[PDB]
Amino acid sequence: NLTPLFEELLQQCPPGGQNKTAHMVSAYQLAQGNWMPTSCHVFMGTISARRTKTHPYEAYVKLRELVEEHKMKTPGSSLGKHNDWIIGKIKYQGNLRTKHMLNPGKVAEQLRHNVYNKTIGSVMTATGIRLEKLPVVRAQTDTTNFHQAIRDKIDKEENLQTPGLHKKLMEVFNALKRPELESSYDAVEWEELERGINRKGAAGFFERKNIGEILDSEKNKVEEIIDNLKKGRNIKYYETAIPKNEKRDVNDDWTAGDFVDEKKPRVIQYPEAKTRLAITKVMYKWVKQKPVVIPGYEGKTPLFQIFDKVKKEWDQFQNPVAVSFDTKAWDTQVTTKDLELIKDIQKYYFKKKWHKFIDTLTMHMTEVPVICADGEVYIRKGQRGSGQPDTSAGNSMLNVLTMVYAFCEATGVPYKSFDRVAKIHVCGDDGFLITERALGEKFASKGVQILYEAGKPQKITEGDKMKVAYQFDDIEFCSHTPIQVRWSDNTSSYMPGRNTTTILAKMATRLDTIAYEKAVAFSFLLMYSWNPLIRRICLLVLSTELQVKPGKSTTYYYEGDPISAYKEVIGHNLFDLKRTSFEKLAKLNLSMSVLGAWTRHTSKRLLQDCVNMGVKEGNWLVNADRLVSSKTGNRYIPGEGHTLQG
């Protein structure tokens, strides 16, 4: 009966190793009684117990007392010599009130709003969409809640992990390495680096120049950093902490969608622009995954392609299920040992001449001086800073290894046989695996405890089970879920679905012109053309002032005709989309009704606005909508057009 109470307590036990010298009993065996726990060090959900005529609740109280004794003993740490320089910049005593990491004081101070996209937002208002009923997106936070987020999320000790965990994770890696690439990676030239780089990439706290200014004028400074690291010499490594959606919350690289910003931690932590340049120039091939050596890495997969790709795997199983990865605050769960495992993997692929570079950078990353925007300093123990160049590749590989390990240990499948029974997909900490139902359910019921012991605790859920999808379109990935559409050529495919309320909110607002808005409308049309409401808002916006070209600040833009650009990447004309999955559409429209963001008139008013425009003489983008054209009697004839990134 008390099995759920024990299962909960086992998730508070310190991870331990296998104990052959004693009896290792589970939460079920404990709940049976006649089992006296001798220590709280948990291994695969089991602890050492003595056989001694014990009542179940007695065993529970002994285990709990053991956990509290252990917790009431697990200490301040010496600062590394290579971090001493930051103490020299301290001017005032600190007020972060951190409990588990040093707050040595505050350095001297150094020298964004959510506004409507007026055209997009007024098209919505014109149809009776109630903007003020849409959820809040891109919220900022004040200094007081920012420091609280630091105390809540970052101010912690490193996770304890199963003794010998990283040896096993390296064994998993050896089952998926690419030996033809061993010791082959070298730095890239400035020209290749500058091709894929956001020149607006943010300056660190002590920095004035952004990525582009440094590239134009201080390459020697970057090269000095590279040289120091290459020879194993310390650099003045630090990260700057800002609240999400602050002005310096800028992505160095192109992103596949706004989901990347949305999954960011509340606390953005990033190295200096000069230092990100130094890291990226040398480690380019790893941090950019050129080539892709992380199995299932979808970081480069456009969101309008991902679910068609995944459905082909799904169709190959007899009774497939998908098990979601749902780690709590992943970046705060990355340990020093985790980082050293990734370093060893990077040294596998890089030429030996960069091994000291990788050693020294990783050392700097194990104990990081972080300077808040307001000047407060904390010394972070391990973890991931979300603005590190290695965030996507390092987290993705760490996630793949940890999940393969956890799946194999839950199911009995050997590491080298994972690829025979399951397919994995990751984007940083986000992801899932597809496997046959029996294995998936085994993994979902045992994985919670195993993943906790591996230092990647899962979000707390019902009966401590990982989320299982029993039908393809219940998969969740990159904040989206598959939705099927029917094309006029008697085929079906999948698009990235998401709640209509959320899509509207993201489309309607930005953080601090029509050229930008038209790029947004095109970007959203590539993703959400399955959604008749989004589709028609997009077509109206794209109908605005045909003479102004789309801006290039967002995920995608079009050269020439946006309707032809759509066809180029989607594979059909917009006009050939004849049906969207009825059941899934209703699911993703529910919150429009719950929140009152629309009324019984909204869809017809938007249709009628499109028809009014499309019946008029001329070549109107709105007639690319199959139903609109059916009511207007006119079609859109596309010119030439191409989809571009950036």
Author numbering: 13 to 86, 89 to 125, 131 to 531, 538 to 671
Quoted passage from the original study:
Compared to the RdRPs of other Flaviviridae representatives such as the NS5 of the Japanese encephalitis virus (JEV) and dengue virus (DENV) in the Flavivirus genus and the NS5B of the hepatitis C virus (HCV) of the Hepacivirus genus, the pestivirus NS5B contains a unique ∼90-residue N-terminal domain (NTD) that does not have notable sequence homology to any other viral or host proteins. The global conformation of our CSFV NS5B structures is consistent with the recently reported CSFV structure with an RMSD value of 0.9 Å (95% coverage) between the reported structure and our representative C-682 structure. These structures together reveal that the NTD adopts a globular α/β fold with an α-β-α-β-β-α pattern. The NTD interacts with the palm of the RdRP core intra-molecularly with a mixture of hydrophobic and hydrogen bonding interactions. Collectively, these biochemical data indicated that the RNA synthesis fidelity of CSFV NS5B is fine-tuned by its NTD through the intra-molecular interactions with the RdRP palm.
The structures of the C-682 and C-672 were solved at 2.1 and 2.3 Å resolution, respectively, in the same crystal form by molecular replacement using the structure of the WT as the search model. We hereinafter choose the highest-resolution C-682 structure as the primary structure for illustration with difference between structures discussed where necessary. In the structures of the WT and C-682, residues beyond 672 are disordered. The results indicated that residues 681–694 are not essential, as residue removal in this region did not apparently affect product level (compare lanes 7–9 to lane 6). The RdRP core of CSFV NS5B is structurally consistent with the BVDV structures, with an RMSD value of 1.5 Å (92% coverage) between the BVDV NS5B N438 duplication mutant structure and the CSFV C-682 structure. Different from the observations in the WT BVDV, full-length JEV, HCV and the recently reported CSFV RdRP structures that have a canonical fold optimal for NTP entry and binding, the CSFV NS5B ring finger bent toward the pinky finger, partially occupying the template RNA binding channel. Although this conformation is likely not compatible with de novo initiation, normal activity of the WT and C-682 observed in the polymerase assays suggests that the canonical conformation also exist in solution and may be in equilibrium with the observed bent conformation observed in the crystal structures. The aromatic ring of Y471 side chain is wrapped around by NTD resides 23–27 through hydrophobic interactions and its phenyl hydroxyl group forms a hydrogen bond with the carbonyl oxygen of C25 backbone, while the carboxyl group of the E472 side chain forms two hydrogen bonds with backbone amide nitrogen atoms of residues M56 and G57 and its two-carbon aliphatic side chain region interacts with P27 and V57 through hydrophobic interactions.
